[PDB]
């Protein structure tokens, strides 16, 4: 088992994961648009 402090750190990460769930679904639009803008410069 890892040290006790380490397990406590995982709990802090879990809180962020809960919010990330809803954000991840919304995060799909920005990610798609960003990738496209870079590809155009590469083709040029």
């Amino acid at each position: 088992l890892p040290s006790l402090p380490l397990v406590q750190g995982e709990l802090v990460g879990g809180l962020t994961c809960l919010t990330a769930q809803t954000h991840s679904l919304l995060q799909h639009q920005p990610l798609q648009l960003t990738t496209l803008l870079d590809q155009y410069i590469r083709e040029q």
């Binding site: 962020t16 919010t19 809803t22 954000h23 679904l25 919304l26």
Partner: peptide
Amino acid sequence: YPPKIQQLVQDIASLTLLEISDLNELLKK
């Protein structure tokens, strides 16, 4: 996400700037 809750997310998207700021706080973390 069932339709009932998909609608709620759609409503959150079409929100006022002040309320969007409240939503942003959750998104920021």
